[PDB]
Amino acid sequence: SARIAKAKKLIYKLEKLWNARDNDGILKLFKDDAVFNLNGVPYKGKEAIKKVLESAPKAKYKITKIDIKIVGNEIIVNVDVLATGPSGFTLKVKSTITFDEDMKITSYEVNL
């Protein structure tokens, strides 16, 4: 409950971060050696993640469903997202975001 809502606040904070392309603000939510799994392709380290952030399309995202799981000291969050692209094509995407005990992102899978 406590860790659930805090994780939820982080997700909705991430939605605004993604739409404003606040890539610095996004990276601050990560661990240094976290992995951004972009469609089966992992990017370990904040240097490879910042690139993933900058190469992302100019998209608008809307959350449509949050699934929070407690696997101990880690919270695994599944989020359904409506991804609207730069030319109006709306696509259903999904993210699997894992937080550690200090609410830092250790893994961030996005599957399309």
Query: Residue numbers of the site for ligand GG2 (CB under 6 A)?
Result: 11, 14-15, 18, 38, 52, 55-57, 59, 61, 63, 79, 81, 83-85, 89, 91, 93, 95, 110, 112
SS3 letters across the chain: CHHHHHHHHHHHHHHHHHHCCCHHHHHCCEEEEEEEEECCEEEECHHHHHHHHHHCCCCEEEEEEEEEEECCCCEEEEEEEEEECCCCCEEEEEEEEEECCCCCEEEEEEEC
Q: Find the shortest distance in angstroms from Cβ 1 to ligand GG2.
A: 21
**Which residue, 9 or 32, has its beta carbon nearer to ligand GG2?**
9
What's the token pair of residue 88?
A: 């109006």
What's the token pair of residue 82?
A: 């409506």
Q: Find the shortest distance in angstroms from Cβ 28 to ligand GG2.
A: 15
Q: Find the shortest distance in angstroms from Cβ 8 to ligand GG2.
A: 11
Q: Find the shortest distance in angstroms from Cβ 73 to ligand GG2.
A: 21
**Which residue, 70 or 112, has its beta carbon nearer to ligand GG2?**
112
**Which residue, 4 or 52, has its beta carbon nearer to ligand GG2?**
52
